[PDB]
XYZ file of C-alpha atoms in Angstrom:
407
model
C 11.787 60.045 -23.290
C 9.418 57.254 -24.328
C 9.525 55.672 -20.855
C 9.003 58.966 -19.033
C 6.220 59.917 -21.455
C 4.637 56.531 -20.703
C 4.870 57.369 -16.999
C 3.204 60.732 -17.639
C 0.365 59.301 -19.765
C -0.873 56.466 -17.584
C -1.366 58.036 -14.157
C -2.265 56.164 -10.989
C -5.904 57.301 -10.871
C -7.007 55.939 -14.251
C -5.002 52.802 -13.463
C -7.066 52.390 -10.285
C -10.182 52.900 -12.414
C -8.947 50.197 -14.805
C -8.159 47.714 -11.984
C -10.061 44.422 -12.321
C -10.213 40.920 -10.819
C -9.224 37.545 -12.262
C -10.888 34.124 -12.086
C -9.305 33.543 -8.661
C -10.910 36.796 -7.378
C -7.467 38.415 -7.165
C -6.561 41.985 -8.103
C -5.345 41.890 -11.711
C -4.214 44.577 -14.144
C -4.494 43.945 -17.895
C -1.860 46.077 -19.633
C -2.539 45.534 -23.344
C -0.396 47.062 -26.118
C 1.854 49.159 -23.890
C 5.304 50.463 -24.723
C 6.430 49.742 -21.159
C 5.334 49.400 -17.527
C 4.713 52.827 -15.932
C 6.168 53.416 -12.480
C 2.617 54.288 -11.407
C 1.958 50.539 -11.618
C 4.912 49.887 -9.321
C 3.887 52.566 -6.811
C 1.137 50.158 -5.717
C 1.539 47.984 -2.619
C -1.620 45.821 -2.681
C -1.301 44.350 -6.188
C -1.248 40.550 -6.433
C -1.634 39.756 -10.167
C 0.726 41.724 -12.428
C -0.387 40.977 -15.997
C 1.936 41.996 -18.828
C 0.501 41.653 -22.343
C 2.422 42.494 -25.535
C 5.054 44.948 -24.276
C 8.212 45.055 -26.441
C 11.349 44.112 -24.476
C 10.441 45.858 -21.222
C 12.905 46.257 -18.339
C 11.407 45.778 -14.871
C 12.700 48.311 -12.309
C 13.256 47.202 -8.688
C 10.204 49.118 -7.339
C 8.138 45.952 -7.954
C 9.349 45.055 -4.444
C 6.873 47.658 -3.164
C 3.928 45.628 -4.520
C 3.853 43.742 -1.234
C 1.042 41.292 -2.009
C 2.311 40.239 -5.439
C 1.633 36.545 -6.108
C 0.612 36.021 -9.774
C 2.371 37.297 -12.897
C 1.022 37.044 -16.466
C 3.503 37.209 -19.378
C 1.665 37.127 -22.718
C 3.886 37.811 -25.760
C 6.150 39.892 -23.512
C 9.939 39.695 -23.404
C 10.649 40.453 -19.743
C 13.963 41.793 -18.414
C 14.321 41.827 -14.627
C 16.971 42.603 -12.004
C 18.132 41.211 -8.658
C 16.039 43.026 -5.969
C 13.007 42.170 -8.088
C 14.214 38.565 -8.090
C 14.552 38.760 -4.299
C 11.015 39.965 -3.682
C 9.712 37.403 -6.176
C 11.768 34.676 -4.480
C 10.142 35.539 -1.153
C 6.614 36.549 -2.250
C 5.739 35.389 -5.769
C 4.062 31.985 -5.897
C 2.580 32.113 -9.419
C 3.888 32.769 -12.935
C 1.769 32.621 -16.108
C 3.933 32.724 -19.229
C 2.386 32.895 -22.721
C 4.706 32.962 -25.729
C 5.118 32.209 -29.413
C 8.941 32.191 -29.411
C 11.809 30.844 -27.315
C 13.404 34.269 -26.818
C 10.125 35.655 -25.459
C 10.642 33.318 -22.482
C 13.154 34.955 -20.111
C 15.956 33.128 -18.323
C 15.288 34.740 -14.922
C 11.964 32.962 -14.337
C 13.774 29.784 -13.234
C 15.347 31.430 -10.161
C 12.227 31.784 -7.982
C 12.219 30.318 -4.475
C 8.451 30.434 -3.837
C 7.033 29.521 -7.266
C 3.918 27.363 -6.915
C 1.556 27.926 -9.877
C 2.828 27.956 -13.443
C 1.152 27.883 -16.882
C 3.477 27.763 -19.893
C 1.543 28.611 -23.065
C 3.299 28.166 -26.402
C 5.586 25.552 -27.957
C 8.286 24.305 -25.574
C 9.815 21.728 -27.961
C 12.717 23.013 -30.065
C 16.320 22.340 -31.056
C 18.440 22.156 -27.869
C 15.386 23.671 -26.188
C 12.801 20.858 -25.932
C 12.076 21.236 -22.185
C 15.509 22.898 -22.169
C 13.949 26.324 -22.427
C 12.632 25.633 -18.949
C 15.292 23.290 -17.544
C 15.282 25.332 -14.330
C 11.980 23.734 -13.332
C 14.064 21.469 -11.102
C 15.010 24.566 -9.095
C 11.313 25.249 -8.467
C 10.489 22.826 -5.647
C 7.017 24.116 -4.678
C 5.059 23.903 -7.952
C 1.489 22.655 -7.561
C -0.264 23.613 -10.836
C 1.219 23.063 -14.326
C -0.872 23.993 -17.366
C 0.956 23.421 -20.666
C -0.588 24.736 -23.892
C 2.488 23.867 -25.906
C 1.524 21.456 -28.742
C 3.453 18.805 -26.863
C 4.507 15.300 -27.918
C 6.301 14.013 -24.790
C 6.378 14.660 -21.045
C 9.640 15.397 -19.184
C 10.589 13.178 -16.254
C 11.529 16.275 -14.236
C 7.845 17.238 -14.065
C 7.232 13.752 -12.662
C 9.935 14.437 -10.060
C 8.386 17.811 -9.156
C 4.983 16.097 -8.848
C 5.786 15.111 -5.252
C 4.276 18.528 -4.485
C 2.502 19.226 -7.797
C -1.256 18.634 -7.782
C -2.589 19.666 -11.219
C -1.258 19.057 -14.741
C -3.398 20.127 -17.719
C -1.666 19.770 -21.096
C -3.209 21.404 -24.177
C -1.643 20.236 -27.439
C -4.123 21.191 -30.219
C -4.385 17.584 -31.350
C -1.007 15.969 -30.618
C -0.663 12.596 -28.882
C 1.932 12.322 -26.123
C 3.911 9.167 -25.395
C 2.933 8.420 -21.793
C 4.605 4.980 -21.498
C 3.586 4.775 -17.808
C 6.043 7.503 -16.809
C 3.412 9.425 -14.803
C 3.208 7.165 -11.736
C 5.197 9.585 -9.562
C 1.995 11.682 -9.451
C 1.316 10.741 -5.853
C 0.116 14.264 -5.033
C -1.697 14.845 -8.348
C -5.425 15.319 -7.822
C -6.673 16.768 -11.153
C -5.329 15.100 -14.309
C -7.028 17.028 -17.121
C -6.129 15.840 -20.632
C -7.717 18.541 -22.782
C -7.953 17.702 -26.507
C -5.527 14.815 -26.041
C -7.236 12.603 -28.680
C -6.101 9.534 -26.749
C -9.083 7.240 -27.571
C -7.706 4.937 -24.819
C -7.045 5.098 -21.075
C -3.529 4.061 -19.961
C -3.042 2.296 -16.643
C -1.243 5.313 -15.169
C -4.570 7.183 -15.146
C -6.215 4.601 -12.884
C -3.040 3.851 -10.911
C -2.801 7.299 -9.283
C -4.782 7.100 -6.045
C -5.278 10.844 -5.466
C -7.011 11.661 -8.786
C -10.452 13.190 -8.221
C -11.131 15.118 -11.459
C -11.103 13.101 -14.699
C -12.342 14.661 -17.953
C -11.157 12.983 -21.167
C -12.462 15.902 -23.210
C -12.331 15.700 -27.024
C -10.381 12.443 -26.825
C -12.891 10.647 -29.112
C -13.639 7.733 -26.779
C -15.921 5.433 -28.744
C -16.005 3.190 -25.654
C -15.133 3.813 -21.998
C -14.136 0.529 -20.363
C -11.526 1.345 -17.689
C -13.771 2.460 -14.810
C -13.676 -0.950 -13.104
C -10.016 -0.619 -12.050
C -10.731 2.772 -10.434
C -11.924 1.232 -7.152
C -8.376 0.998 -5.802
C -8.421 4.799 -6.173
C -10.495 5.858 -3.182
C -10.623 9.562 -3.967
C -12.447 9.758 -7.307
C -15.544 11.920 -6.802
C -16.273 13.637 -10.130
C -16.349 12.030 -13.592
C -16.995 14.956 -15.945
C -16.938 12.869 -19.129
C -17.936 15.597 -21.563
C -17.385 16.551 -25.215
C -16.714 13.012 -26.436
C -17.776 10.444 -29.028
C -19.112 8.077 -26.327
C -21.818 6.040 -28.064
C -23.134 4.113 -25.048
C -22.699 3.709 -21.296
C -22.397 0.098 -20.067
C -24.791 -0.864 -17.278
C -21.784 -1.488 -14.988
C -21.777 2.302 -14.473
C -24.470 1.469 -11.919
C -21.783 0.037 -9.638
C -20.557 3.541 -8.700
C -22.181 5.405 -5.814
C -19.708 8.052 -4.690
C -19.732 10.572 -7.563
C -21.257 14.030 -7.093
C -20.729 16.156 -10.240
C -21.445 13.503 -12.863
C -21.217 15.616 -16.033
C -21.855 13.408 -19.077
C -22.789 16.227 -21.441
C -21.942 16.694 -25.135
C -22.016 12.959 -25.911
C -24.002 10.473 -28.018
C -25.829 8.583 -25.259
C -28.940 6.870 -26.614
C -30.753 6.847 -23.253
C -29.960 7.401 -19.588
C -30.294 4.135 -17.626
C -31.754 3.440 -14.211
C -28.372 1.966 -13.221
C -26.826 5.451 -13.400
C -29.213 6.507 -10.636
C -27.757 3.977 -8.200
C -25.226 6.776 -7.555
C -26.693 8.284 -4.404
C -24.114 11.022 -3.764
C -24.791 12.897 -7.031
C -25.111 16.625 -6.390
C -24.733 17.843 -9.994
C -25.785 16.129 -13.265
C -25.109 17.602 -16.719
C -26.366 15.578 -19.707
C -26.414 18.358 -22.311
C -26.428 17.570 -26.053
C -27.281 13.875 -26.006
C -29.648 11.606 -27.932
C -31.672 10.513 -24.875
C -34.917 8.842 -25.935
C -36.886 10.046 -22.887
C -36.447 10.926 -19.226
C -37.074 7.978 -16.869
C -38.439 8.273 -13.345
C -35.288 7.192 -11.455
C -33.835 10.694 -11.968
C -35.756 11.363 -8.753
C -33.346 9.175 -6.801
C -31.122 12.264 -6.446
C -31.921 14.046 -3.189
C -28.689 16.057 -2.861
C -28.654 17.054 -6.540
C -28.378 20.816 -7.001
C -28.019 21.606 -10.730
C -29.375 19.382 -13.503
C -28.745 20.050 -17.204
C -30.305 17.551 -19.629
C -30.397 20.305 -22.256
C -30.539 19.544 -26.003
C -32.012 16.080 -25.491
C -35.268 14.383 -26.549
C -37.169 14.555 -23.248
C -40.933 14.923 -22.883
C -41.960 14.650 -19.212
C -40.446 15.207 -15.773
C -41.541 12.536 -13.255
C -42.952 13.261 -9.780
C -39.948 11.429 -8.320
C -37.754 14.223 -9.699
C -39.926 16.652 -7.732
C -39.592 14.724 -4.464
C -35.992 15.972 -4.600
C -36.087 19.289 -2.730
C -32.641 20.518 -3.813
C -33.076 21.105 -7.570
C -31.751 24.594 -8.326
C -30.497 25.004 -11.920
C -32.756 23.113 -14.343
C -31.413 23.831 -17.839
C -34.243 21.988 -19.585
C -34.553 24.076 -22.737
C -34.449 23.333 -26.465
C -36.178 20.023 -25.732
C -39.481 18.348 -26.637
C -41.052 18.664 -23.177
C -44.807 18.078 -23.371
C -45.743 19.323 -19.895
C -44.517 19.460 -16.318
C -46.754 17.395 -13.998
C -48.305 19.407 -11.168
C -46.243 17.443 -8.605
C -43.568 20.066 -9.418
C -45.329 21.952 -6.619
C -43.211 19.756 -4.344
C -40.141 21.640 -5.608
C -38.837 24.393 -3.319
C -35.213 25.272 -4.101
C -35.527 25.936 -7.852
C -33.294 28.870 -8.830
C -32.576 28.939 -12.589
C -34.591 27.311 -15.389
C -34.358 27.731 -19.170
C -37.554 27.198 -21.179
C -36.966 29.115 -24.425
C -37.742 26.197 -26.698
C -39.503 22.991 -25.576
C -43.196 22.257 -26.229
C -44.730 23.409 -22.934
C -48.261 24.390 -23.952
C -48.882 26.754 -21.027
C -47.076 27.599 -17.807
C -48.183 25.681 -14.737
C -48.589 28.153 -11.891
C -46.191 25.970 -9.878
C -43.338 27.405 -11.959
C -44.308 30.727 -10.403
C -44.455 29.086 -6.974
C -40.702 28.481 -6.722
C -39.298 31.079 -4.264
C -35.592 30.968 -5.122
C -36.551 31.081 -8.803
C -36.540 34.775 -9.692
C -36.974 36.697 -12.953
C -33.272 36.231 -13.708
C -33.611 32.502 -13.060
C -37.043 32.020 -14.661
C -35.891 32.524 -18.254
C -39.355 31.897 -19.686
C -41.671 32.915 -22.515
C -43.838 35.946 -21.815
C -47.295 34.982 -23.116
C -47.645 31.877 -20.943
C -46.409 34.019 -18.055
C -49.277 36.398 -18.858
C -51.687 33.442 -18.722
C -50.953 33.320 -14.982
C -53.156 35.383 -12.618
C -51.936 38.996 -12.416
C -51.649 39.025 -8.615
C -49.174 36.125 -8.533
C -47.130 38.067 -11.090
C -47.471 41.095 -8.799
C -46.167 39.073 -5.841
C -43.156 37.943 -7.882
C -42.622 41.531 -9.065
C -42.755 42.831 -5.484
C -40.259 40.156 -4.463
C -38.040 41.481 -7.260
C -38.350 45.204 -6.526
C -40.158 45.825 -3.193
């Protein structure tokens, strides 16, 4: 009676109204605090992301096989019970499985029998008595995994993940402040491209990090690096293109950082850098530069050595003037320059053309240069600016911007 009442409550129309999209722009359905899964969910054929959140001991009927495009599946605090035709359609269609848990029994034993599983986030502790990576021992059977996110408060890495890593390309382990014992057991990551140690608290870089030639994304976030000294051995790794060293205790950057040229999204934000050096601007391929929340003494001129740079965020620094060299760069779009000590913007900012978003709530800009109104791609949504200095501008320029906004 409870199941059939659930079917009668949540009809297909309001479910279509409630349909949303995930981060991957895929059709998702967030079922929160439900007694079960209505068959109106399973009557769908175009669903790809079946999200199941806090449903007590549900039993999945076979009609999931009708959901022809089903690829993702979100289990958050949900004990899932499934049958064999469902397992068949998930063995031929399903290539993703997102399991969030706080208990071993919440994790079902069917999820290890998938023949197309490719993306897989296990959230919750996986280390237990006779169950430390033995909850999930069927991850050998899954031979097509490519993404493995583990928010599990983990202390060691299984070798079987290293075996799977012939096809796996992303491993992000969240441990809430627990150090793993790497011991150079990660070198089978030939296909790994994004090693993301979130809140690892390593304070050191093992050789396995700069032994893996396919790594392109390296963020040692919240690892409390007082010093970063292992970038020199990265030149054997030809594929590194983005060093997003953010949210760290990095006190200083050695001048040898000027040796690099090939980075694009150099994000060195949320650090303790005393000043940006000219050496850092020897990197010619930089397209994105985030230096938010630093102790930079000033902004030098060599920031204008970045022609392909698109977004620049030197927010929450001690910066007073933007050089004309920065305005020779035609590709500046997102200039998060706010909460600074900026005295003024030199009129050579009229050279700028592609400015899109700027933040100026804060700073010390005495009055708006009219060149800030000159930027075409910069609209009212992008020009997050004070209103009085905007009113200091001639009314007809404001009218032109308004007409561009509304027509």
